[PDB]
Design a protein around this ligand. Structure first.
Ligand SMILES: [Mg+2]
Lengths: 55, 90, 342, 231, 60, 60
């Protein structure tokens, strides 16, 4: 089952990367090529009918 | 958390163990205590309430609104000194 | 040669954006559309030995780094730039960074500039007192005194002549007085004394702040409170003092309230505009604090310990003289820190 | 080795050494990052500027010595650093600015997005004088009921009826909704305008983009006037 | 298999746009994103729990 | 005192002292940890008000 094989290879590589350093959400789970996240939206997008009425 | 009588009997006086046993048989271990944000019943600090403070508690034997002694069983017969000196350094 | 290294990251960065974009797409879909159909599949599926591997590997992997973890603890430049797609045109931020790249390399191709005066270099690259010439003083306008109608005749001995209705200050004397004043600043700096730079004319703050910084001294650019030295306990007692070692590093020792109320008197006062700071000069006299000041043709020389004859109205002349004094202090500070090392 | 006591701040001999030291720190940042462009969303008037109060800054900026103009100067430099383009900002600027943000962020907000209920109804309450109104707005065809009675029956004055219709007339949705209004207290005018206020507050859920037009028409403002005991 | 079948479905949706980095590179990029969404949830819960206790015992 | 209790809870939460139940209950943990270093010997006498005479006007 390559699906379970590659998933199980992806889960253990992640374990090692997080193990290398103290696991902190902001740092350990930063975006690719990024220093760290801020663990901090409900700005609903107007629907096409809502926006048409406003226009 | 519910503690075995042995542990509780090494820290609290015997007179108070019965109250602790009855409270551990009436309050389920899975009780999710909530915090009251209207009335503050407890003090702002932690206290087991097992020892009577010479200043922050009512003086034993002194008459007051919540005195539990009978009116003929008070033990304050001298009134020349302040009954409750200030706590700590004084 | 090594570009692929960055390319490998960018690939992941693009993939991450794709995963996030479609994670938000599934956040809008109602659960009724996905959940029941998803569960039904499992009701019609049978876990295999391998499937079970991830059934518990992910449970622990999610019960270790998501639930039983510490949420907190008890390419660096421009790390928040949102790069644009390789097909889209440059964003405003990228154009700014693209221009900054040009500014460093190409923008200065073609010629170099020599023998041109740059105002900022008077503050950041002051000359040493031994290299100052009459020409340099004259270039800064130090020789231009006040109108002959405003002459304070007590400065007669500093005057070289009158020209175009103003008195010309003798720069030969200015240089000798400047060197003497500079040596005093260096001595006090090398001895560990407190040097205060006072100037309250518009524009002098920048020079005053840098002079204080490079001599580890102090400055006042806004207003001299009358009584700062004679009435120090009512004005400066509240402000914080600190103890420092011979290297000017804070010792960190907490100070007794007795030590924090004692007057902290400057060891040397430098005044850029003495004609508007009579209060400070008189307090310095009362407090036995030696003082240095720029003395223009309308200014009283005897009110200061070490006068420097010179134009006090031009920011260039003032900053030129201040810079020389500041570097002299810096050399004294560097000589004191060097003797401590060896 | 030898130790001496010296003033902590380079601005010790100034009138307000604490304020001048803080201004100098911010001025250094504005000089080091003079080139960084500013936000173009400033034209869009981003609603973010939570700076500490004059009194809160007086704890760190000299106390009694602090002057209002000195506080104004602090805000002009805090805003300028804050308005640097977010993409091109750096940690140094943010670190310095963090100390000057109101600590109210410690806690959270008390507002939860309003949504239609299980039956598609927007429920809002309104008050005018001593009157109160609880309205149920749903998408419909312009049917209105006041306390179970026809509008012309409950409200005899046409001006009271026109007041109720005004919020729907602003969004040009008079025939797009059914309204079930329940009102109590005060008199006809208080109840009619309390219903007017409640309909306007209930219409924002159907299209939050029309709140600005409702506010501009004046139907989302609670009328504060009440009978005043003569003093 | 929801624990795993929801993540497979996520990649299926991304497969729509895809219409083997996806074997190990995308698979890892997804687990990490989920961990950051499961950590923000726990952070929000802490704020609720702290706002429902008496953070200010003596004055406020 | 207010910052000593907030730190106590923040630490007792970050150390984890049912995920579904981790969205409803607000019980932070043991009473001892929440009130660590807050006793009758240091809290009461420091918060008592009206403890110092600072002014007085007599008239005859
Ligand atoms: Mg002059």
């Amino acid at each position: 089952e390559k699906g379970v094989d590659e998933w199980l290879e992806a889960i253990n590589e992640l374990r090692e990367e997080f193990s290398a350093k103290e696991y902190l959400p902001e740092t350990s789970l930063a975006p690719p090529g990024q220093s760290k996240v801020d663990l901090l939206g409900s700005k609903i997008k107007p629907t096409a009918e809502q926006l048409a009425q406003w226009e | 958390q519910h503690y075995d009588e042995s542990l509780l009997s090494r820290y609290y006086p015997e007179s108070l163990l019965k109250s602790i046993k009855l409270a551990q048989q009436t309050i389920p271990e899975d009780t999710k205590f909530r915090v009251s944000r209207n009335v503050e019943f407890a003090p702002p600090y932690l206290d087991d309430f097992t020892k009577i403070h010479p200043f922050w508690d009512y003086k034993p034997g002194m008459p007051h609104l919540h005195a539990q002694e009978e009116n003929n069983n008070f033990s304050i017969f001298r009134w020349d000194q302040v009954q409750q000196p200030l706590p700590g350094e004084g | 040669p090594n570009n692929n290294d960055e390319v490998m990251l960018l690939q992941q960065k693009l993939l991450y954006d794709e995963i996030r974009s479609e994670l938000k797409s599934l956040s809008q879909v109602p659960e009724d559309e996905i959940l029941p159909e998803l569960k039904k599949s499992l009701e019609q599926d049978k876990l295999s030995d391998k499937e079970q591997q991830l059934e518990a590997e992910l449970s622990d992997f999610f019960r270790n780094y998501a639930l039983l973890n510490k949420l907190f603890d008890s390419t660096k430049p421009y790390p928040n730039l949102i790069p644009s797609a390789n097909d889209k045109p440059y964003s405003s931020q990228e154009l700014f960074l693209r221009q900054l790249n040009h500014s460093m390399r190409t923008a200065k191709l073609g010629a170099t500039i020599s023998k041109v005066y740059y105002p900022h270099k008077d503050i950041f690259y002051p000359p040493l007192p031994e290299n100052i010439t009459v020409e340099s003083l004259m270039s800064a306008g130090v020789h231009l005194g006040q109108s002959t109608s405003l002459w304070r005749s007590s400065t007669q001995s500093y005057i070289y002549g009158e020209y175009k209705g103003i008195h010309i200050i003798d720069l030969n004397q200015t240089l000798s007085y400047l060197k003497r004043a500079a040596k005093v600043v260096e001595g006090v700096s090398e001895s560990g004394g407190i040097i205060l730079f006072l100037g309250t004319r518009q524009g002098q703050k920048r020079g005053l702040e840098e002079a204080a910084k490079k001599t580890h001294g102090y400055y006042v650019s806004t207003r001299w409170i009358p009584g700062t030295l004679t009435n120090s306990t009512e004005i400066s007692g509240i402000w914080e003092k600190q103890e420092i070692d011979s290297n000017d590093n804070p010792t960190e020792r907490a100070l007794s309230p007795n030590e924090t109320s004692k007057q902290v008197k400057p060891d040397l006062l430098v005044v850029l505009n003495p004609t508007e700071n009579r209060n400070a000069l008189l307090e310095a006299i009362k407090s036995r604090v030696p003082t240095i000041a720029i003395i223009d043709t309308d200014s009283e020389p005897s009110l200061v310990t070490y006068p420097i004859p010179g134009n006090d109205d031009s920011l260039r002349s003032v900053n030129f003289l201040l810079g020389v004094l500041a570097r002299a202090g810096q050399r004294g500070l560097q000589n004191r820190l060097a003797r401590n090392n060896e | 080795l030898p130790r001496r006591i010296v003033p902590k701040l380079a601005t010790f001999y100034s009138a307000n050494p604490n304020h001048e030291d803080r201004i100098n720190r911010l001025e250094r940042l504005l000089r080091k990052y003079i080139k960084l462009p500013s936000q173009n969303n400033n034209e869009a008037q981003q609603t973010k500027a939570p700076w500490i109060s004059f009194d809160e800054y007086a704890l760190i900026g000299g106390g009694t010595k602090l002057k209002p103009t000195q506080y104004t100067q602090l805000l002009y430099m805090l805003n300028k650093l804050h308005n640097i383009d977010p993409q091109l900002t750096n940690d140094e600027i943010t670190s310095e600015l963090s100390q000057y943000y109101k600590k109210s962020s410690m806690l959270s907000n008390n507002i939860k997005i309003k949504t239609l209920d299980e039956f598609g109804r927007s429920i809002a309450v309104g008050k005018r004088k001593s009157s109160t109104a609880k309205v149920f707005v749903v998408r419909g065809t312009g049917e209105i009921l006041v306390n179970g009675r026809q509008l012309n029956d409950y409200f005899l004055k046409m001006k009271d009826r026109e007041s109720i219709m005004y919020p729907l007339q602003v969004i040009e949705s008079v025939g797009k909704y059914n309204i079930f209004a329940t009102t109590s207290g005060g008199g006809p005018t208080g109840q009619a305008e309390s219903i007017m206020h409640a309909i306007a507050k209930a219409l924002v859920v159907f299209n939050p983009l029309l709140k600005s037009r409702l506010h501009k028409a004046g139907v989302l403002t609670r009328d504060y006037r009440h009978v005043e005991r003569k003093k | 298999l929801k624990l795993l079948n929801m993540i497979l479905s996520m990649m299926n949706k991304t497969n729509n746009n895809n219409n083997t980095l996806d074997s190990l590179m995308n698979k890892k990029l997804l687990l990490k994103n989920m961990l950051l969404d499961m950590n923000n949830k726990k952070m929000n819960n802490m704020k609720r729990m702290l706002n429902n206790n008496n953070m200010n015992p003596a004055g406020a | 005192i207010n910052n000593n209790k907030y730190n106590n809870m923040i630490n007792l939460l970050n150390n984890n002292n049912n995920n579904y139940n981790n969205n409803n209950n607000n019980y932070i943990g043991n009473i001892n940890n929440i009130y660590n270093n807050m006793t009758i010997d240091n809290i009461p006498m420091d918060i008592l008000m009206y403890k110092y005479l600072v002014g007085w006007s007599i008239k005859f």
